[PDB]
């Protein structure tokens, strides 16, 4: 359950999330778009879910993709800001899950974002330690799908 | 159309938006909930769009309502952050409109948020000057609906 998964966010995990986000969240547009393009490159099968975005290969030049990418980063910002209060983190996660459940995005499908996050982190000198911390946060969302 | 509405966001307007947001955005949970509860109290009919939130009379104590309220504030955070670049502000606003268009929320309906905003601002001692600034930001969104 999402409640048990949120309890997996221990002291050090929350700390590593904040330290890495401090850098990653500094450039929401750049890292957000990098995140999306990496997802589409490593998992071409997910492109079907984003038909509305148009030609995703245009990257930054695609206004709809850029708008989506920037917005996506504010969802992560939201998560990070709610780390202090488990009750708030949970209600925010369930709220977020609504539209993804409606699009029929499964926990397994959502989990594909872990690869792109790991690669973006690595490009900023954040190793496995951080990728694993982010995988734990992603697991909270997966628990609600 | 959205670009034209964005043209109304002058240097002075953006300055008042940023200064007021520095305070309003410092307590997203408290002010986000205040915004929603004020909307429902002043325009009871808007509750018809939020059946999923359940018993909205519980206010802050309602996990779903609290989750929605906090999330709403990150959309405003997004907007404030993109003020200095019309191209990004526009793509984020159009991205935002997609789901509200699907919900059949007209520009007139959306405009009902102006009263609650004015009241929340006044609770923090921000006068008409600031209220007019926000009405202009809301107008950009209305142009997309
Ligand atoms: C770090 C993970 C992710 C975050 C934080 C995130 C964030 C968001 C946000 C904030 C929105 C806009 C609000 C909404 O419509 O719900 C959104 C839309 C969407 N998301 Fe997610 N998402 C993530 C991963 C995924 C994945 C892995 C998929 C699918 C494989 C997915 C599919 C969608 C789709 C199809 C849309 C609509 C895009 C559009 O038409 O504009 N998301 N997501
Ligand atoms: C400044 C004003 C507003 C902001 C920033 C805002 C922000 C948001 C955000 C970020 C979401 C979640 C993402 C999504 O599903 O689109 C949302 C959902 C929603 N909004 Fe808006 N919104 C505003 C005003 C309104 C108004 C005035 C109405 C209708 C009278 C409305 C109705 C809805 C509905 C029904 C949902 C889904 C709620 C749920 O079931 O969880 N919004 N809005």
UniProtKB/Swiss-Prot annotation, chains A, B:
Q: Where is the Globin domain?
A: 8-145
Q: Which keywords does the record carry? A: Cytoplasm, Heme, Iron, Metal-binding, Oxygen transport, Transport
The family database entries (Gene3D superfamilies) matched by this protein are listed as:
Globins (1.10.490.10)
Q: Name one GO molecular function term.
A: oxygen carrier activity
Pfam families per record: Globin
- Could you confirm whether the keyword Transport appears in this record? yes
Compartment(s) where it occurs, according to its Swiss-Prot or TrEMBL record: Cytoplasm
Q: Which residues bind heme b?
A: 100
Q: Which SUPFAM superfamilies match?
A: Globin-like
Q: Which domain of life is it from?
A: Eukaryota
GO cellular component term, pick one: cytoplasm
PROSITE patterns in the record? GLOBIN (PS01033)
Q: Which family does it belong to?
A: Belongs to the globin family.
What quaternary structure, including any partners, is listed in this protein's UniProt entry? Homodimer.
Q: Which PANTHER family match?
A: BLR2807 PROTEIN (PTHR46458), GEO09476P1 (PTHR46458:SF1)
Name-wise, this protein is: Globin-1
The organism encoding this protein is Anadara inaequivalvis (Inequivalve ark)
């Amino acid at each position: 359950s999402v409640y048990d998964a949120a309890a997996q966010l221990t002291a050090d995990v929350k700390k590593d999330l904040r330290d890495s986000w401090k850098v990653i969240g500094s450039d929401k547009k750049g890292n957000g778009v990098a995140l999306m393009t990496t997802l589409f490159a490593d998992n071409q099968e997910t492109i079907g879910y984003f038909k509305r975005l148009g030609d995703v290969s245009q990257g930054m030049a695609n206004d709809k993709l850029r708008g989506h990418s920037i917005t996506l980063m504010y969802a992560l910002q939201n998560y990070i800001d709610q780390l202090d209060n488990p009750d708030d983190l949970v209600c925010v996660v369930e709220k977020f899950a609504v539209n993804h459940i409606t699009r029929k995005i499964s926990a397994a499908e959502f989990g594909k974002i872990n690869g792109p996050i790991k690669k973006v982190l690595a490009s900023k000198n954040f190793g496995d330690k951080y990728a694993n911390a982010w995988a734990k946060l992603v697991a909270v969302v997966q628990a609600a799908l």
